[PDB]
Symmetry: D2
Subunit: 300 residues, 4 copies
């Protein structure tokens, strides 16, 4: 009858803020947190001062389960417990399902799916509770595994290709990209454009992608043609295909380019590489299996 | 080889600051704290939000002992545990010695004796970790019980008396100014001394001013007594005050004057004072106080 | 008209929280604060480290007025400035009105009247921005002067009296919660305080007893039968809290003073226990003797 | 005469911590700070809440100079003032020298040169006083300009080249690698294919590494092992390979910049650098060399 709620989410996804507000509005619920015990057994003031050990982490796991057994063995006043950890490791989630089955408690899951760009923005302002960017990346990968989101592993039988972006990659940025009035030979990124020709003259199919809205309501392909006439004629990129943001799509550069990949690029080509600039997009190709070469500082 | 260190001290005595610095320089030691678990089971952002109930306090006691058993059952890597609580309740200190007797662990005690005036000064700046002044008082009383410090309960056979202070009490506050006239008299308090004396009480006058200087060790004492006896009209039987090179706090000087000169000769039923720290002192050692004005401090 | 808004209120009354929310909702307004400049010229990490000097406070006053002149002597975009200080000193409030009359600006006043009990509760949790209780007292006195609230100085011609509280004073307590109704005996008497009421009654004083208990008059006559018969206090009058008076001990006893006690007696002293009530008698002019630790 | 001390340094370099400790140890000194006034005129509780307006930044500049004139025009008790700003803009530093020349005051400079890697580490833990990574970059660029540190603009006449890195770039990683597990299965396909494609276009392939060259007894043991992998097992057509020395216990950051200025820059016209580790990628980019970061190299 009693519940064991596990919060699933990367650091900064809102787990602690919810757990506090849930216990206030629903009496009988208690919190069990790893970070709280880690900081308590060492008497630390700042959460970043902590250094992991198999011995320390073993004591913390012990404190979690012993406290869970003790609280849930109380009267009918005790409705359940919340484990406000990241719970991104499959072995830890299984350990809580093995534990509930042995004593007759219900395991519930509270998922906190927050976008990557927002998680990084929150982690930079987190202060002493901030995690290194490589561990936040490692955790968003575990979040995608839990959510069941796709990872690319190739497309056998189709031609080999390289994806090129226009936004700050083939086109040198000024200042927030460059104007469509300034589209001449002085806005070309020499080394990157030389790379597209070098790959095209080696059996690779050059697929060009862009985040720029394709057109207006009255003319849906206005900017698409003004971008293709630059990439093909003024830049000299030997492209086989150019798909960009559909007219009227207000979504983030992050999700638009992933959708363009799975719908138009992935089923027709065997993508071996992606040349991009913007950090959030570079992070996206890398986590879904496509290899990236970030050509410039693209922070956003 | 395995210790269970209990920190004894009021909130603000330096327990957490020590525990953190001890675990850093002595590996193998782990911390078990009550406030940390209280804040954790409720998911609170600060200490102040925690509402005390016997059901929550029972779970917290459980977490303390279960974690202590688990950590201490772990080979030669663990040197012991620190219980960074106030440990001012005798029943809780006994429970840790019973736990140690039952599993063969050594209970060590780390005492943090910090003076009252300093504890109040630290508690006012403590913010959200601040405790109500009545609970800080209740805890310093438990600290004195542990330290074995004396509490007055009377002195039978000896004559009944009332202690009166000078500065702020029998003498009005100017702004403690220069040494005085007939206009510096506190009417209602001086009227009280004449009334108690007439009732068969011994008026004992005490003072926080220095008795004299290096050349004359009893200069300011005589100028204070000539005011209390002649200009004020207080029927005193004795006047003991701060000696020569005594540069200590008003707090400890008046407690020493009490135990050495007043307590063995008189049966003190009351103390009329002004300064908060001194008023707090008489009250915790058993003497009753009537604070006549705002004396902050 | 270009404004100069002065915030009037003790530390913890909500001045900074308002000033921030006003500038956000009303563009063109700028803030000038003393504590911010005091902390800035010394490069301090927290405002309890600061040491007040005549040279330093003079520089801070200079920064206030020079910044006010500079901001207000600009475009039609600048609507006015907020001086988020306590402004409890009459000389500083006058200096800002003199400043507005030599350049033609309007001085508006934003009053923050927060009760004493609430100010102390906020100051204990204020942390490093906390002020000593004696300066918070000194400031609430200046707030009462500004608000025009009364201060007692005697009532010549009427009989001299001493006010006595029941719970905590004439009667002992259990710790933190008064004694039960039918549990009032002879062992609940506070010896030294009850002896004092008999002393004063013989000394020509009128003993006025006051209580904070509700209360029909069932609980009132239960209290008076204790004070008069079991305790032996020679009272001339006993006024207490009404049937359903859900207010504070603080304000109820001040009202009982001005309506029933002050016009009939010349109160020379008040014997009380509870800190908030002791603080109340003292600030309105009546002298107090706090008989025990009354924090709550 | 009286001083006007200007602190020069990026946010997180220790300017405020010094200014506080200097005023405590040296009486007569006063602080004038921009961030303090910006936060004060808007009555904000946090620094990240402030929005940059030109009417506002103008009022803040006004408050700075008016307070400086007022404090320094005092008695012989006033010894000087500290301007605890970043002071990375040359126009603002000049404005304080024009001001000091106009009233007869000595301008002193207190430089806070803290390495890039350390500045980023401090900025990630700074909380609400944290600055966006692009503005921290823009500020470290202004710090290099002040310090007079070099920026590459090409090397004409000399042959065109592309710089490659071994660990992480040409070779796949474990999280470094063991010298015994150097197969053909440890090659990064697309990057090694690029070194062959760039050599095919006429670029000189210069390989660099942050790995040790050898032990105490044999100073050139590991250099032979790394080159026998790059040349034979990987198939990279290199013209030169310079790497970290024997007892060089310094950062990957500074070692590769020194290898660039001493051995690579005077002999080749570097058009590009292919690297992996973030700190090294940040280094090539700020000194003028273009980088293509091949993988997540945080670490
Ligand atoms: As373009
Ligand atoms: As005197
Ligand atoms: As009663
Ligand atoms: As290798
Ligand atoms: Mg881009
Ligand atoms: Mg006194
Ligand atoms: Mg009372
Ligand atoms: Mg590398």
């Amino acid at each position: 009858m009693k519940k064991i709620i596990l919060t699933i989410g990367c650091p900064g996804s809102g787990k602690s803020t919810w757990a506090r507000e849930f216990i206030a509005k629903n009496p009988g619920f208690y919190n069990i947190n790893r970070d709280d015990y880690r900081q308590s057994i060492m008497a630390h003031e700042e959460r970043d001062e902590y250094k992991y050990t198999k011995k320390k982490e073993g004591i913390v796991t012990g404190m979690q389960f012993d406290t869970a057994k003790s609280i849930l063995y109380g009267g009918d006043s005790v409705k359940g417990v919340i484990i406000s950890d990241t719970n991104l490791n499959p072995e830890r989630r299984l350990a809580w399902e093995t534990f509930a089955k042995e004593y007759g408690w219900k395991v519930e899951h509270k998922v906190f799916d927050v976008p990557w760009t927002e998680l990084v923005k929150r982690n930079s302002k987190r202060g002493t509770k901030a995690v290194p960017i490589d561990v936040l990346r490692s955790m968003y990968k575990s979040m995608r595994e839990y959510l069941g989101l796709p990872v690319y592993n190739g497309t056998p039988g189709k031609p080999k290709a390289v994806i090129f972006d226009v936004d700050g990659t083939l086109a040198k940025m000024n200042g927030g990209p460059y104007d469509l009035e300034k589209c001449d030979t002085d806005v070309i990124n020499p080394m990157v454009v030389e790379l597209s020709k070098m790959y095209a003259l080696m059996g690779y199919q050059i697929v060009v992608v862009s985040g720029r809205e394709s057109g207006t309501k009255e003319d849906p392909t206005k900017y698409y043609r003004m971008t293709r006439k630059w990439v093909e004629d003024i830049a000299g990129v030997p492209l086989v295909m150019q798909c960009q943001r559909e007219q009227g799509d207000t979504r983030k550069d992050d999700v638009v380019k992933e959708e363009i990949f799975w719908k138009h690029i992935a089923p027709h080509f065997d993508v071996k590489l992606a040349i991009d600039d913007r950090t959030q997009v570079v992070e996206m190709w890398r986590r879904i299996g496509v290899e990236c070469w970030q050509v410039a500082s693209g922070d956003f």
